[PDB]
Amino acid sequence: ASILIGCRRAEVARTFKEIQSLIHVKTKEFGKTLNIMKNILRGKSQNLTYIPRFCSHLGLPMQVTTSAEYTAKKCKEIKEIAGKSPITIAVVSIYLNILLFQIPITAAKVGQTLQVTEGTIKSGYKILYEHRDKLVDP
DNA sequence: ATGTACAAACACACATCAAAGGTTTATAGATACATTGAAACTTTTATATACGCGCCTTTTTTTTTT
């Protein structure tokens, strides 16, 4: 966690699974340890980071990533709490925007590359195949 | 005349002393287990809250011999 602290506190945010890949922490000993730790400094006293690191993991040009910052922020800004650990609803912006482009990143390839449920995608994409109205920049 | 068994030098052949060193092993360093008690550890639950995932469980599709 002090890494996840040290990471996020250094303005680089990584998912719990990502560190879990580095160290298997039973995903639970992580959580309780984090809460105290954060409050350790508070007494001693940001999911945006995920959009680009994902695009590169798929090897995409900047525009597809460029757009998602607008889309995810705009999808976040109005409504759609949408997600229970917004890690997922980040990726759907790529999926939203990758389909706005025509580049083969077929859902199955997305999943294992980013180790995400496929179900959260399409249902997450439900709120997108309907919200396709206001993301028109050009 | 006359040299011979006998025992003293007189410098030496002979038994002794002494440094060195492999080998053995208690003896100890360090070693790897063997003990155990002790506290750091596990469990319910239900309880809604809002998740999945796999597995309970099932419906629809899928496949060899006479």
UniProtKB/Swiss-Prot annotation:
GO biological process: DNA-templated transcription initiation; RNA polymerase II preinitiation complex assembly; transcription open complex formation at RNA polymerase II promoter; transcriptional start site selection at RNA polymerase II promoter
Any one Gene Ontology molecular-function term assigned to this protein's record: RNA polymerase II complex recruiting activity
Subcellular localization: Nucleus
Keyword set includes Zinc: yes
A GO-annotated cellular component: transcription preinitiation complex
Function, as annotated: General factor that plays a major role in the activation of eukaryotic genes transcribed by RNA polymerase II.
Further information: Present with 6750 molecules/cell in log phase SD medium.
Subunit structure: Associates with TFIID-IIA (DA complex) to form TFIID-IIA-IIB (DAB-complex) which is then recognized by polymerase II.
Designated name of the protein: Transcription initiation factor IIB
Source organism of this protein record: Saccharomyces cerevisiae (strain ATCC 204508 / S288c)
